[PDB]
Design a protein around this ligand. Sequence first.
Ligand SMILES: CCCCCCCCCCOS(N)(=O)=O
Ligand SMILES: [Cl-]
Ligand SMILES: [Zn+2]
Length: 258
Amino acid sequence: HHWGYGKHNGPEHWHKDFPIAKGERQSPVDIDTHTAKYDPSLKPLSVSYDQATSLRILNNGHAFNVEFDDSQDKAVLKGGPLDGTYRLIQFHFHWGSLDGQGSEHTVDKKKYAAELHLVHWNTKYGDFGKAVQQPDGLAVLGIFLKVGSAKPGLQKVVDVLDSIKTKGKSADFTNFDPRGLLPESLDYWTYPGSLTTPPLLECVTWIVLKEPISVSSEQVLKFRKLNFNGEGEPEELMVDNWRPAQPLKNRQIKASFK
Ligand SMILES: CCCCCCCCCCOS(N)(=O)=O
Ligand SMILES: [Cl-]
Ligand SMILES: [Zn+2]
């Protein structure tokens, strides 16, 4: 009985195996734009993905991960609310069964069609494993997806999904440039949170971009053709793999823009 997004193993069940699910800094959260406050102490955000080197794409039964070689100082996120440098290790998405839902974070309760998560770990901790044992071990750059014009830079990801339809399948995925998934503006909201999937560790500094990227209906429809199940098992489409907004508790969301 592994965790998932179904009626008997979904978000409302996670707290039993992962008590931190009801913690003090859980993610995602609803971003109340009027309550968010501009923070002058925030330094310029720096996203340097020029030397990013992807290696493989994997269907882990919950979503698909585009993995990067993080053995060297490449693809780093710094500045903004961050102290030090964070290295990109992988990115993945959360999406819905319909265009009207899919994102984890919401903006004034608005749900986007999907949400992209670029996961980075604080280099001061040596590697990802040690970083997830620290309150400032991770930084996730979240980007909303809305349905409209196609995102050219996402097509290579879309076209490889047919080869990793089921849980456990992976495929070579080199030379993918994540810069092609970024919106024009880097305006963002930030707050201290957690991983949105078990183990739900509270080690994340969330940086959620205000400007969504547009993807075509055809592109997201292909995301929805993936399977939660493994090969040879009854088909359960990989859709609605998002955790709903959690209590904000003793936290404040800061804006990088006035
Ligand atoms: C402690 C070992 C488990 C670490 C698992 C990390 C999964 C990270 C990806 C899922 O998180 S999210 N949605 O970006 O917040
Ligand atoms: Cl189901
Ligand atoms: Zn995620």
